[PDB]
Design a protein around this nucleic acid. Structure first.
Lengths: 53, 134, 77
RNA sequence: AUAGGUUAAUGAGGCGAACCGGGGGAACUGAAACAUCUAAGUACCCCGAGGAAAAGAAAUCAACCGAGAUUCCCCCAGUAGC
RNA sequence: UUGACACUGAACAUUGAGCCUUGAUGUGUAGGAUAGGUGGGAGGCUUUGAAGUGUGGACGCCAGUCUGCAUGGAGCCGACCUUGAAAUACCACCCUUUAAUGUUUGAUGUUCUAACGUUGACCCGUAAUCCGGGUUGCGGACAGUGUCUGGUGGGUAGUUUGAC
């Protein structure tokens, strides 16, 4: 699903790169451990200036 | 023996990127910095099958500017190496040149037609670069 | 009871037609799966028996927005 | 921190002729046998509700003219169709 | 009971394909030419240090071109003639076949853990071998379950099995 990074994590992380990973991978590993951010409309806006720049 | 000269000229275009013809006609006048009157070697690719003899196009292209006639026929793989004039010709003389080949071929479009005609255009100016437009 | 706790899906009956059109009553079961959903607001996992489609409703609306309706209906977990 | 535990507050529970909405759902029979089909979503079963209940203000029809939520009644027609 | 999809993930390697740029690759008869092909049209090149040529990648229809550091050094070719075309003198599109890359899914291998399973241990809700929750170990994207689907199926059901 559409998810935006929060951490480093290799091969798919660069702190702020929207990746289309697999659902199970996002919902059971990246989201619960905070490794990523649920890429919903407002969270996309919450990143660009607050924790991106 | 491709070295610095043609490569600096190739820095103007990209083999992957497809531009518009309005850019290539002004860029080819900057592509050829040669000391002799050259031209452009365009290898336009067809949109139908050139194996079936009933559909192949062979004839003459109308160039109202002046040369004003260029004989063009299809190739083995299915292209036409029709020139679009000398490099010394100006912008609008080349703008109206490629449009002349377009509608002349579009209204003389063959019987068992299957789709829009012009798909790939391979503009290759004499001493210029490898340009890719539609 | 085989009921999706977020949508309201349940086994709806049907007909198991043969080639010769023999109507024999059958039953379409939802693809339910007990899953633990990590709620960050409560900083706690919430095991819920939901359908595969229900999971996709969660991925779209948001787990907390979904649980808003559950306490609104009393679908106590 | 929650799960949990105790007490207070408010409501519910059950019965009931049919009618109403919904969840399930026959066979006999007809077909001159019988399996598609019919019987019939009827019988029966379960839940909920009111005094009526349900539906209900068009992402509806019509027809290039117009009508304007739903429900019930009489035709349309045993026709168009299946 | 079989396979597909769903719950269902991650890397790593190998292996098919696609794709980006790409160096190569492409002898009719002719031939200085391993001219693919069409090929616009006669100068490239360069003193951001060259050919000849040793060896080598290379291709190897073995008729050969290209040529990685290169002492060498400032030139190395042409167009053109014997070609149905004119040529790695400069030459694109980049394709038939190659190879590399980023990427993209497919199928196999190997490991991992975080979904999922745990009728393993332990603590608590509690004076309960229920259940739930928490720790932890073990398995682990298998297993198992839903939808579709081929096979099997007298286990079960509805029925037929003519008249003379």
């Amino acid at each position: 699903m559409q998810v935006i990074l929060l951490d480093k994590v290799a091969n798919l992380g660069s702190l702020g790169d929207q990746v289309n990973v697999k659902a199970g991978y996002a919902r059971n590993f990246l989201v619960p451990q905070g490794k990523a951010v649920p890429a919903t409309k407002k969270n996309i806006e919450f990143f660009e200036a607050r924790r991106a720049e | 023996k491709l070295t610095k000269r043609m490569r600096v000229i190739r820095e103007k275009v990209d083999a992957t990127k497809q531009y518009d013809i309005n850019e290539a006609i002004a860029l080819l006048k900057e592509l050829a910095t040669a000391k002799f009157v050259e031209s452009v070697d365009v290898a336009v690719n067809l949109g139908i099958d050139a194996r079936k003899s009933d559909q192949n196009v062979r004839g003459a292209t109308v160039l109202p500017h002046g040369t004003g006639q260029v004989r063009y026929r299809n190739d083995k793989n299915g292209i036409i190496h029709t020139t679009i004039g000398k490099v010394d010709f100006d912008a609008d003389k080349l703008k109206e040149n490629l449009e002349a080949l377009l509608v002349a071929l579009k209204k003389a479009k063959p019987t068992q037609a299957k789709g829009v005609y012009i798909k790939k255009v391979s503009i290759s100016t004499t001493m210029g670069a490898g340009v890719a437009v539609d | 009871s085989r009921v999706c706790q977020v949508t309201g899906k349940r086994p709806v009956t049907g007909n198991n037609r043969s080639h010769a059109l023999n109507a024999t009553k059958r039953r379409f079961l939802p693809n339910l799966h007990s899953h633990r959903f990590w709620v960050e607001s409560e900083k706690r996992f919430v095991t819920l028996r939901v359908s595969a489609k229900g999971m996709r409703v969660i991925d779209k609306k948001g787990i907390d927005t979904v649980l808003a309706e559950l306490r609104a209906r009393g679908e106590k977990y």
